[PDB]
Short mmCIF file of N, CA and C and ligand atoms in Angstrom, two decimals:
data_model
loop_
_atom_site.label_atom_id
_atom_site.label_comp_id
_atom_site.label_asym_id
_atom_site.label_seq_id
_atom_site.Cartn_x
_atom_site.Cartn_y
_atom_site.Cartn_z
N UNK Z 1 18.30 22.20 158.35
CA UNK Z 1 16.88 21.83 158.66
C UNK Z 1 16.10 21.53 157.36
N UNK Z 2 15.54 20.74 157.53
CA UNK Z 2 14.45 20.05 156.06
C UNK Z 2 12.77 20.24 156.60
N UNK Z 3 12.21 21.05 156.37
CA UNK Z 3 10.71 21.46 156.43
C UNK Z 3 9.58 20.74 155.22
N UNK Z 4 9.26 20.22 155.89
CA UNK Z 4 7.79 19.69 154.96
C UNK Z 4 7.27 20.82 154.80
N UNK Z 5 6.09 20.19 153.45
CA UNK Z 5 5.53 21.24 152.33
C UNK Z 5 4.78 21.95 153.33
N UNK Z 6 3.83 21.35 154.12
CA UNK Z 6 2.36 21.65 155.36
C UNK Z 6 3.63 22.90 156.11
N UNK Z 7 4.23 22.31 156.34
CA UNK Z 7 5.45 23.20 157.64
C UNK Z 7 5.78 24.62 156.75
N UNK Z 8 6.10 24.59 155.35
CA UNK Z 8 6.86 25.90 154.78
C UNK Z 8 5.57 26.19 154.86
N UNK Z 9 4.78 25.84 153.81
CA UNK Z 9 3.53 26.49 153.81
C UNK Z 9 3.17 27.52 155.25
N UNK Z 10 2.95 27.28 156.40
CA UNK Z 10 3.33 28.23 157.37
C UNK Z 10 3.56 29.01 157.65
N UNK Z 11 5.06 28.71 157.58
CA UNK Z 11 6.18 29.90 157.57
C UNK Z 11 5.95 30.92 156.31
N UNK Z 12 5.55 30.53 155.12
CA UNK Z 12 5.51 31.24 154.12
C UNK Z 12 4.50 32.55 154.30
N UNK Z 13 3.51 31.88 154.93
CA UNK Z 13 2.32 32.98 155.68
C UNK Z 13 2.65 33.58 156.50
N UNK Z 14 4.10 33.75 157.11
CA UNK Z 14 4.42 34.76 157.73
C UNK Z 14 5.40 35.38 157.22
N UNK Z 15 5.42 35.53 155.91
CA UNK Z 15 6.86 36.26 154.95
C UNK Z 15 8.01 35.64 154.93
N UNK Z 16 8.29 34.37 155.23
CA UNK Z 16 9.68 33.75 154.72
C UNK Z 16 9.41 33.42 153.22
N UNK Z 17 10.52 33.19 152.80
CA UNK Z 17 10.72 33.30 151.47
C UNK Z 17 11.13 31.88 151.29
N UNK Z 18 10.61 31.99 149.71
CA UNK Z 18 10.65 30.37 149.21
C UNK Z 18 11.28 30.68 148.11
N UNK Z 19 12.76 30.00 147.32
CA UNK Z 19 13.45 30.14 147.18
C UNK Z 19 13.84 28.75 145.93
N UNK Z 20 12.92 28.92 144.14
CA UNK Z 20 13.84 27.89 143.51
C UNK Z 20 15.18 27.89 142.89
N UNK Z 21 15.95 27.00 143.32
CA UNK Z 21 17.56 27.34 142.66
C UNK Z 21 17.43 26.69 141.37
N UNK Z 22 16.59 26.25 141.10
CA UNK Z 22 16.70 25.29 139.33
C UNK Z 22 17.21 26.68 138.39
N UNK Z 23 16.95 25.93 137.19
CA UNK Z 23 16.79 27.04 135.99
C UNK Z 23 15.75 27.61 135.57
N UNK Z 24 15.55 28.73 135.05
CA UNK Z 24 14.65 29.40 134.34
C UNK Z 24 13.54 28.20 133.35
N UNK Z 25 14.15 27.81 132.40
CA UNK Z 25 13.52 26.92 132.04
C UNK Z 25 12.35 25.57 132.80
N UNK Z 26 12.84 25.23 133.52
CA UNK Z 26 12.58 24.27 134.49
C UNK Z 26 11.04 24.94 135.64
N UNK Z 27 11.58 26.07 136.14
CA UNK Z 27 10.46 26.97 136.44
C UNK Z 27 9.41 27.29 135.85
N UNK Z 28 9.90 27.92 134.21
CA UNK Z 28 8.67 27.98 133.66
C UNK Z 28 7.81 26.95 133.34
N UNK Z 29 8.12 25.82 133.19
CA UNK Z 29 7.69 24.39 133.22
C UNK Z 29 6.51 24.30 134.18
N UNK Z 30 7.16 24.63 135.26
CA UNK Z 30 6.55 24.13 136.58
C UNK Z 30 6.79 24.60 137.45
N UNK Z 31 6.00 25.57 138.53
CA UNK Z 31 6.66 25.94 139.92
C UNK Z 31 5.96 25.97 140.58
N UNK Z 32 5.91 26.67 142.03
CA UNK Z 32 4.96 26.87 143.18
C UNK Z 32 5.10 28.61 142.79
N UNK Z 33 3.91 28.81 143.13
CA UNK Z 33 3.63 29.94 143.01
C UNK Z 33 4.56 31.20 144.20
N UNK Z 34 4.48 31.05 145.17
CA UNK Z 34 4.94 31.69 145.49
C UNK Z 34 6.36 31.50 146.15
N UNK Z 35 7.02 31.06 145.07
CA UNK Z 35 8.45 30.92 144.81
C UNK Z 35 9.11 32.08 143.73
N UNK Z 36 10.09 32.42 144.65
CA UNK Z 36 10.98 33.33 143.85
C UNK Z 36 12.20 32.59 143.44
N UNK Z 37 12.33 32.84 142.37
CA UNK Z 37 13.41 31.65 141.30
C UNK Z 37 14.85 32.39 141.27
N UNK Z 38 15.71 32.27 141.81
CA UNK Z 38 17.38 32.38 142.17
C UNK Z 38 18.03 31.49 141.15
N UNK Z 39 18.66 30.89 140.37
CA UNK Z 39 18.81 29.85 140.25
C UNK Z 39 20.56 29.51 140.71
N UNK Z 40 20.80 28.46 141.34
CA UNK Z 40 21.97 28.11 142.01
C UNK Z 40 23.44 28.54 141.45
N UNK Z 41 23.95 28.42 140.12
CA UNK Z 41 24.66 29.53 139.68
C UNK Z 41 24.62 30.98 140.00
N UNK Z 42 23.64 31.47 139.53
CA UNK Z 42 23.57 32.52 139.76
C UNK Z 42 23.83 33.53 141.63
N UNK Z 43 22.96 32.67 141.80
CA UNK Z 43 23.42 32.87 143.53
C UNK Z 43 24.93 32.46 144.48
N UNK Z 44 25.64 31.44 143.15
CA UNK Z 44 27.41 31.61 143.19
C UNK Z 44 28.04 32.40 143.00
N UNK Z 45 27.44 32.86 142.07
CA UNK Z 45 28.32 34.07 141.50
C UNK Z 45 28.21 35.30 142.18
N UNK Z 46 27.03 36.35 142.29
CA UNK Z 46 26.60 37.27 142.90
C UNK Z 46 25.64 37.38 144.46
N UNK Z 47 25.41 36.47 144.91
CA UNK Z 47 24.67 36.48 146.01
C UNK Z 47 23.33 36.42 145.73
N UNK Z 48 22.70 36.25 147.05
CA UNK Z 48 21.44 36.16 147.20
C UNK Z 48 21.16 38.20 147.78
N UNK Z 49 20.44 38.61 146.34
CA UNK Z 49 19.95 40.10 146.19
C UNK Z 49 19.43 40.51 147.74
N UNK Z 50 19.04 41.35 148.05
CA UNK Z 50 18.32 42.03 149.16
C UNK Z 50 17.05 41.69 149.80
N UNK Z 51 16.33 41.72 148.27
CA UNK Z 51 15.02 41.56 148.04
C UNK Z 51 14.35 40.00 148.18
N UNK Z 52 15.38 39.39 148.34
CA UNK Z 52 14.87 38.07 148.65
C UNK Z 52 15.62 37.49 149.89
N UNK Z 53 16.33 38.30 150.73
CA UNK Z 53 16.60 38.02 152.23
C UNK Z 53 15.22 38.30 152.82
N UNK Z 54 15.19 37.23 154.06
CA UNK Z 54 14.13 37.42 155.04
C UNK Z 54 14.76 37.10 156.22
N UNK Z 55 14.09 37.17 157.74
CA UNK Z 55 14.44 36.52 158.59
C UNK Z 55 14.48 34.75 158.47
N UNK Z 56 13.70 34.26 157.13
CA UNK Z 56 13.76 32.72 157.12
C UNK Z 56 13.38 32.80 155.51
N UNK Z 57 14.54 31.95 155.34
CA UNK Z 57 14.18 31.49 153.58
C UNK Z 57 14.24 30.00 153.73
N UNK Z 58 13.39 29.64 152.75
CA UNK Z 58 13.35 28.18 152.43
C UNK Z 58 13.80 28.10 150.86
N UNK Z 59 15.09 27.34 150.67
CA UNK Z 59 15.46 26.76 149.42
C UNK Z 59 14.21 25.29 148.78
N UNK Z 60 14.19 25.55 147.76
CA UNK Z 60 13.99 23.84 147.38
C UNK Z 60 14.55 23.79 145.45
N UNK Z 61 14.46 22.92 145.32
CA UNK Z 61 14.90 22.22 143.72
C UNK Z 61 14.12 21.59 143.48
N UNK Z 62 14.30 20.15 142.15
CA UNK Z 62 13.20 19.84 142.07
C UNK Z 62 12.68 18.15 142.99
N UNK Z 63 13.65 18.00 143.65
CA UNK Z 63 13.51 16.40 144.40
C UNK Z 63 14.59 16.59 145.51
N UNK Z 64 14.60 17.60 146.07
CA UNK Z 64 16.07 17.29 147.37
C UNK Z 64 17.38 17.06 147.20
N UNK Z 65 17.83 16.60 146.03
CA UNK Z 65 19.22 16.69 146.04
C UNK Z 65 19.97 17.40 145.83
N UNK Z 66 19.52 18.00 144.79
CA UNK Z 66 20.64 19.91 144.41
C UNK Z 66 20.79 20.18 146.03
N UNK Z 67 19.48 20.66 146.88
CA UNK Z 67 19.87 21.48 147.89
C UNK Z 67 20.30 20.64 148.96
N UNK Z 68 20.28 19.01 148.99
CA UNK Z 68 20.91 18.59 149.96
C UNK Z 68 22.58 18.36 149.54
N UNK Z 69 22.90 18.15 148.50
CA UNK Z 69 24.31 18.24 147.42
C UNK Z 69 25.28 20.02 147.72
N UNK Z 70 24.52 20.95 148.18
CA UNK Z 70 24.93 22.49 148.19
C UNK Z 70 24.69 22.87 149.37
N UNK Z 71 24.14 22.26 150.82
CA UNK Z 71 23.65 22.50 151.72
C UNK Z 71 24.42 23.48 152.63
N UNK Z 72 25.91 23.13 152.37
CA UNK Z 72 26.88 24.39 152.91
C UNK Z 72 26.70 25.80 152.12
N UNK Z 73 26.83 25.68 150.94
CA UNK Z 73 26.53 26.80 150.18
C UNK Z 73 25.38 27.30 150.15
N UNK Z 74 24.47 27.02 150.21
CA UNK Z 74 22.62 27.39 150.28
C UNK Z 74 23.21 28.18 152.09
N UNK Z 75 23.53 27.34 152.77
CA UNK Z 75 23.83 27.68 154.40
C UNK Z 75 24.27 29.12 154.14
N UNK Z 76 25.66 29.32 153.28
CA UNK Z 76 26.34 30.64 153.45
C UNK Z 76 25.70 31.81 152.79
N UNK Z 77 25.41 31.64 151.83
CA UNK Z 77 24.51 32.24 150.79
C UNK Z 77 23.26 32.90 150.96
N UNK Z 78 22.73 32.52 152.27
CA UNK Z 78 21.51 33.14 152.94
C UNK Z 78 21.16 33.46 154.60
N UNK Z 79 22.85 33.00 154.34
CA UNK Z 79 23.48 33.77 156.18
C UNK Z 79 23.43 35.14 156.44
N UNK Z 80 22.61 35.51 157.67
CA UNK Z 80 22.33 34.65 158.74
C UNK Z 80 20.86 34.16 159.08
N UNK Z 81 20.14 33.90 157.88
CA UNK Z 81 18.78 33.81 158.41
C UNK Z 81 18.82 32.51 158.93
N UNK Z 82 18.02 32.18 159.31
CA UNK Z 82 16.92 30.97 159.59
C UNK Z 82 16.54 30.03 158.30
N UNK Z 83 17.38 29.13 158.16
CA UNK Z 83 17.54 28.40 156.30
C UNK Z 83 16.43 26.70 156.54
N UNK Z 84 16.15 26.97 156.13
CA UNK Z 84 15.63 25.72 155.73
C UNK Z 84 15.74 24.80 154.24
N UNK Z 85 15.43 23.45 154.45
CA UNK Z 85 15.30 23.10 152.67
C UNK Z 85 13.90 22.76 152.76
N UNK Z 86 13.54 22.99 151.23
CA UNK Z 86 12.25 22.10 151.40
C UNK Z 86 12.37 20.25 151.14
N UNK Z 87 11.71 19.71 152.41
CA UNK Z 87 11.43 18.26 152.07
C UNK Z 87 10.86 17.40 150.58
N UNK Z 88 11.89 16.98 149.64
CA UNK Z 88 12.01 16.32 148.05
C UNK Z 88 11.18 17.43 147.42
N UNK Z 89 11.94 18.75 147.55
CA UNK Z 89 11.64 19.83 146.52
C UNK Z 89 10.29 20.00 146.14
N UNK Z 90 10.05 20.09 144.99
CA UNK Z 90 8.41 20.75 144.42
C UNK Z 90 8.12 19.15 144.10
N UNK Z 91 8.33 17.75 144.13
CA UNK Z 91 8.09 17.01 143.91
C UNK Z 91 7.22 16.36 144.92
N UNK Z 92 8.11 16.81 146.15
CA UNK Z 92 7.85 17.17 147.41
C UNK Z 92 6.57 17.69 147.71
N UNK Z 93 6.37 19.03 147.18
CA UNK Z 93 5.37 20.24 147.09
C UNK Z 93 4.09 19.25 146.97
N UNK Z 94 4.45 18.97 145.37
CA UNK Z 94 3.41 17.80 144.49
C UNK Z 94 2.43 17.16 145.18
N UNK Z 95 3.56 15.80 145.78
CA UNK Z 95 3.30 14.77 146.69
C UNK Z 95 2.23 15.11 147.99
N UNK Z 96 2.48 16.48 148.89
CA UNK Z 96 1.41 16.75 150.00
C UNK Z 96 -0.09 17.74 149.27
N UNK Z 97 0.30 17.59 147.56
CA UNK Z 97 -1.41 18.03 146.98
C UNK Z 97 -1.20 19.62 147.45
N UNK Z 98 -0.65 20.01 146.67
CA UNK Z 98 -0.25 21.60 147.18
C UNK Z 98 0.07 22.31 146.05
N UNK Z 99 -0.65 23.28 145.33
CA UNK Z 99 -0.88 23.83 143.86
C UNK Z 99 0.51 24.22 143.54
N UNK Z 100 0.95 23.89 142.24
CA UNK Z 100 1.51 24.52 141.49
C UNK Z 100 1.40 24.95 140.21
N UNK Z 101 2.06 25.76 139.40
CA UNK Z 101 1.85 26.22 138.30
C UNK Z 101 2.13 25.90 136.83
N UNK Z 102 1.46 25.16 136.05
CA UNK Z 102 1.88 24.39 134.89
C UNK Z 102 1.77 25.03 133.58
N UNK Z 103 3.11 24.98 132.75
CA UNK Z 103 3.24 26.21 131.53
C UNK Z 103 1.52 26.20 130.75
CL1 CL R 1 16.97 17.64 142.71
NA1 NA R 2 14.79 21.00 148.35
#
């Protein structure tokens, strides 16, 4: 499932979790605020922690392709919730005028 920014936004107000797989670097750059930063290695290697399972997580990157490129793995990795991606990532975010955070 691919959720527009208006649509997570939503869900986010009811405790699903928003979820960037980029890098550290890349984040600090630029993010949505209330994104918790995983980054996609890392969540290969060891899983997706406790603390960032919900009944619904939303992945995004920074334009849709990482998470449409990993979509099986993002799938297993945060099984069994309710997964979504976000629609062209924080670029995505950007595009529907929706704050993010600049170093
Ligand atoms: Cl991307
Ligand atoms: Na995405």
């Amino acid at each position: 499932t691919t959720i527009s920014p208006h649509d997570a936004q939503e869900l986010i107000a009811r405790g699903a979790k928003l979820i960037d797989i980029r890098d550290a670097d890349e984040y600090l750059r630029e993010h949505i605020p209330e994104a918790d930063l995983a980054p996609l290695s890392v969540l290969e290697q060891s899983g997706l922690p406790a603390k960032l399972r919900h009944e619904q997580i939303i992945f995004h990157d920074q334009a849709g392709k990482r998470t449409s490129n990993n979509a099986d793995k993002l799938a297993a990795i945060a099984a069994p919730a309710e997964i979504f991606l976000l629609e062209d990532g924080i670029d995505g975010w950007k595009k529907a005028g929706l704050p993010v955070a600049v170093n």
